Amino acid sequence: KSEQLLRIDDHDFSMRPGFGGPAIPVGVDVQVESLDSISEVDMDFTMTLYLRHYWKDERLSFPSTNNLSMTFDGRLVKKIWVPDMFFVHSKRSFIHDTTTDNVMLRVQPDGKVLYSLRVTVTAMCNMDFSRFPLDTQTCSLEIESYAYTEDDLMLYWKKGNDSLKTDERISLSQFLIQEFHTTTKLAFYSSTGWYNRLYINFTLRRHIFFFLLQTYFPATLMVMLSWVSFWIDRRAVPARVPLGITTVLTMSTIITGVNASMPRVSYIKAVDIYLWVSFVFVFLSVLEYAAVNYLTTVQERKEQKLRDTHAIDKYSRIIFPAAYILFNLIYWSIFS
Amino acid sequence: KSEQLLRIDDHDFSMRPGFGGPAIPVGVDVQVESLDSISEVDMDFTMTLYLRHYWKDERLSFPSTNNLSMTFDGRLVKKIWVPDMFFVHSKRSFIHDTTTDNVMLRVQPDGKVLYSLRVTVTAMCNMDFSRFPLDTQTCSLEIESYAYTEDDLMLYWKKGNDSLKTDERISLSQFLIQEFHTTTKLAFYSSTGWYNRLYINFTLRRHIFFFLLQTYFPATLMVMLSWVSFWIDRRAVPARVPLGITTVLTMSTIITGVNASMPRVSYIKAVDIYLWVSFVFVFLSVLEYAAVNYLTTVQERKEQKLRDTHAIDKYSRIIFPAAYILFNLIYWSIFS
Amino acid sequence: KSEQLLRIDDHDFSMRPGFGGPAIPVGVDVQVESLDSISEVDMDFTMTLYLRHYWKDERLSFPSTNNLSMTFDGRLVKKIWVPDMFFVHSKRSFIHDTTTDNVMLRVQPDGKVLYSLRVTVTAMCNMDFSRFPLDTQTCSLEIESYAYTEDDLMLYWKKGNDSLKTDERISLSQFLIQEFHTTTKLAFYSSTGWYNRLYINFTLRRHIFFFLLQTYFPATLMVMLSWVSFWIDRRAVPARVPLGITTVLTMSTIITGVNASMPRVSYIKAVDIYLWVSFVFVFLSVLEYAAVNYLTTVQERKEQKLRDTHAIDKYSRIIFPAAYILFNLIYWSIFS
Amino acid sequence: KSEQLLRIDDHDFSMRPGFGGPAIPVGVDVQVESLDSISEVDMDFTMTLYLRHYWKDERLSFPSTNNLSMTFDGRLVKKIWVPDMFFVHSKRSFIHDTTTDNVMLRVQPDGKVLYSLRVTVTAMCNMDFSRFPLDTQTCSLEIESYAYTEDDLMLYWKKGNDSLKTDERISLSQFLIQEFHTTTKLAFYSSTGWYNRLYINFTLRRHIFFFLLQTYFPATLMVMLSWVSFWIDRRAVPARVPLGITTVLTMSTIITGVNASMPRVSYIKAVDIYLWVSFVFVFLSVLEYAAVNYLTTVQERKEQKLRDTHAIDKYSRIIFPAAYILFNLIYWSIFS
């Protein structure tokens, strides 16, 4: 029996190696397989990865006439000591078990142990949508020991920045993934003390041109279309009035459709500012012709009682485009 | 073997410590890690937290030449007595088990025991949306012993109000979280008797300006736009009629879009009152010109058979804005 | 050891108490904690409740010098006999297990046993939406023994109608819950014989005024608005025609929005009848002016070749409101 | 002990009864409790049912002084041989376990065994929506032995067509269920050989009148409304043009709303053909007046340079309704 080469019953496997002495170093290597999905409303993402641990235990040394190693499955985990790593700020996770548990153990003759498992984890990531759709989001994944402090277990990246590997075909449907790197930081808990924590960082970006074409283009086109009425004769009321009211209706429908296709985030974003400024512009373009018509009627009635182009249109033709251009300059300087 | 230092087989671990005597005090400390999501339709929220228990058991005392403690994992839980806390008014919950069970046990030489576990719980919270979107909701989380009454187990916060800690980056997408505090209350069950219950309370608020801009602004703009027709000559029927009917259509589309983006709550809210009052105003603005046109036609026909501005417009120009301002004053005094 | 006071190994616990003799009575008490959700499309509801069983077993009697009882957790269930209750016409259910199994056992010195557990169950409930939104739905929850007939196990409510308790704050977002009561009925299975079944009944109702305001008000307003054209001069075709066609468009949009916000139930309801009758009314209001215009053109052409208000408008002004009022009377007499 | 009456340890229960001889007959009875839901997009349905097996085993015979039987729960399944039935072409299934496993075993003194369990199963069902909403779908449920061929296990319906029972109140929200019957067929696998398979068949139908009223009625009404313009004077351009363009807009909105409420099936159906033919009709009704207006302008200009009803309208008034009636006749003859 292979388990009789390792004196399992001659040692206590409820304690860490080197109990009572210096802490044992444990190295961690991570390979990212894929990113499953990302949820903006709940602010989380799902990742599938390989987790590997490296440590040495003299109690597992066995004699041999060569340098061959022994490989064991997940059934030997319950009989030996293994590190109790867990993912910080996670919501749910599981280990794949088809067609059997995806756990592997390799033991060297001198006691070096490799422990590898395949896991899927969902972790939280706070996001800020104030600059949507020009926002940038940075999410991280954290790994920490649960019950062992820095005095008993020392956690580190085995090969520094080379310990993280990513798949060549990792991608997201609506996001761009970039800038993968690893960092470490010490965390303190008042109940037990200090812990070592490992981080995996990456950055997310959107496709700007899609949102520009879908949102900013129709609003600008409708605003420029609302300026057509300034070049129409003031005497054609049944042409000036329906044009303005239908432009208002079209802008309202465009705004509603754009809102219906965005994530349900309940605070003001830049796109909302742009759309409502456009709506205000169309509203003012309607009030302008209302005032022109009233003044024309008053003047005609006064002339009849006593017995060309209106200046308001001339000034509006210059003022409205200049105001819109100034607003666009300020907006795109603020939001880059 | 570490388990041979504790005389497990020499004691009965099916009974609580101090059986037959005074009740044993048990202290509870809670650290809130994050709030996962909140559902308005089903009236529940999801929270992830750390739960810690403190109690003393003389049966676990072991001799030692120093003051070092022993740490055990979840496998020792089944061999000793642990408190049976459960969450009241919960719908579903689970304990994380990646890469292993997130359960820790620490035993002091004098018998003091610390029992900590990481859990995710979904709990109910009744909500009232009558004052939406100016509503305020208070939700709580309750912890109680399942099988032990106050005569056998005494439950309390270990350090009073300092026993609750919250993460610095806890937030919700569409809500503001504030006013975390802890309270206790005794509960009675006729089947068994009195129990001690612990509470964790917090308050939720919305973003008012977003809803104001998205809902109240377009309705007010459309109502003010409907008053433009009072300044147009009564003789231009093909300009007065289409303007009113298109304003009605635009208001209807705005109301439908607003309803489509709100939670499916089937009772009357303040926003509905505002929108339908606006719809009634636009309807009356159409009936007014209908009456003016009919009266003008009647007068002209009578004059022809026998062979300026209509007073209704003059009175409407004053009455409609005054009525709308009065309605807004009353509404915003009632709903603050 | 507490389990050595009960002669577990001296008795066979695979058979019911009193085997070979009269059936053993078993009492059931239910406390409803909350209603989680209700699904109209799938016709089911979710409930969380406490289930308690009472029975006597002489094999569990133990000597004592006082009248104290012993409390055991879920681990003793597998060593003794317990009733095998199950929920009839259920889809899915589970027993909560955080932080441990929510199962309690209390044994009296004379052999009386109390068995309590906390369970969540999803059960079917057939619904009829013909009278929507004025429909009333009655749902029930059923409890029955699985393997024991009335000859071996007699099931009953322990305290009659007092055996059902409900939480003070039980509520639903879009429904009103009322009339909780308990009933019993005998059921027959040809494979095994008769069984005793217990019922928990309740009634659901909606909020009428919300649906009235959201649906019936806009349709009536649009129908009344379509009657405005009968008071406009027949000579203003560019005012009569666009008004009618835009009214038809507005009614169509209102009907589509109302349909988009209702549950996806694929058969005719009362609200559909109301909306389509309104649509037919607006259609006829357009055909009426078409006929008036054609007749006016024919008369003018005939007069020119040979070389006031049209009666159709006068009759329509009376006929249309009277027909609509009669339809409303009949509809609200049929649907109350 | 009841298990000592059956010589469990004196026989090998890893082999089927009658090993090495003729195959053992096994009878199956099924009672359908309810249909939970049906998914058109994923093409599957969910059913809850009772499954019963009948077979004889001489190794379970026990002496008795009467004719009473012994009932055992799910714990005896692991100690005896039971048939390994499974559902073919299923996606997911489970056995209910509240408050315990819903498994029953009854053993007669002569060795007859009844094995009953309650199960919920989701099975695939290919559907064809070409004739939607006049389509008819037939779904089936299949039961087969997993590891035993016809040479070792003979599977059949115990009582022929009487072995299937259905609940009196089984129904679906949007479907009609009818024609339940049972059939058998032999299946061949090249790896192992022939198997016996059992079928449960039923048919699904929709509610025709609901879809007719919701879809075909508005399209026909709009098409008939588009013919009104042929009776209006050609000299009223501001009445002819807006009517046609608004009719086109209304038809487009109706088509979009109808598409938004149908299942997301990506191929052409009959309703799409009807709606797009109607759209083409309205388009042609607009081109007709465009041509009439151009011809009238040309004629007037020619007459002025040189110095009644247009025939196109007269022919259109007859041609358009006749063409639409012919199309409806052909369509309803093809699609019945």
Added chain:
Amino acid sequence: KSEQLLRIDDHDFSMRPGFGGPAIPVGVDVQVESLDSISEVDMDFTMTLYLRHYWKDERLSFPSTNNLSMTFDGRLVKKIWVPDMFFVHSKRSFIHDTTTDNVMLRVQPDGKVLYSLRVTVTAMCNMDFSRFPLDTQTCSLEIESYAYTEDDLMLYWKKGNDSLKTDERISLSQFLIQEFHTTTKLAFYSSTGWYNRLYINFTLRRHIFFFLLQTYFPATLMVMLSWVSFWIDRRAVPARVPLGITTVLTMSTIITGVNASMPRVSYIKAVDIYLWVSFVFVFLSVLEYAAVNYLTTVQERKEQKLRDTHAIDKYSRIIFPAAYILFNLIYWSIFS
């Protein structure tokens, strides 16, 4: 006992057959039962299949007087060595267990072993929607040994390209499935070394005519309808202006409805290019009449101060259709 014919306790089943010598060949056969669903947003698909393994082990040989084999269920798996196959780039998977585990083992007298199980797996598949709806997607399923390299376990298709079988009625609601074939490729891992990987490839296609009719037809019809105004007299402003603005509104509504029914993929596709070019065309058709009207007014005013068809319309009638035809030619040459 059947398990006593196989000397289970006389051999170590923790090591592979032929340990220390040449690698053991293992053959794999796959039968695809159905495709459950496909998700475009998350880029994955679900498949149900049968997995079979073939290998020889001399340690399982048993004496017999004939050539009959022994069949064992899933309970023997834990006592013998079985290959540890797993699915690469999968997200979740499970093995069906109703009414029992769907695992079968057949052992020949000479030691040949057949191991078959029924599994459901969800796997990732990167997709590109740039050419939507004319895109073609190729997805694959990968099988690899977890812990054994090519030096210890040699994995191959048992019968080459005949080892893959597919159901006759496999289909998808919105996709066409074709070109099933099998390939192999060697993969390298720096931690352990080389592995053998098996592939199952297939291709997906859409229904072109449905998307054409739903999207390209209405846009072309609206663009052609916008050219009607070039044939209308320039003196009818209340007919030219509302037609153009309503055409713009109709195009906007069509674009919004089309966007609302497509998968939420956030980058530019071909259909978007087509729709926005059409929108630009309608915008230019409105600017053209604006310019014509302004020029006509200027000319009339100049003539009055001093005291036929406009050329712009004549040139537009030719230029606009030619430009649209050229754009369609270029677009359909680029996108085929």
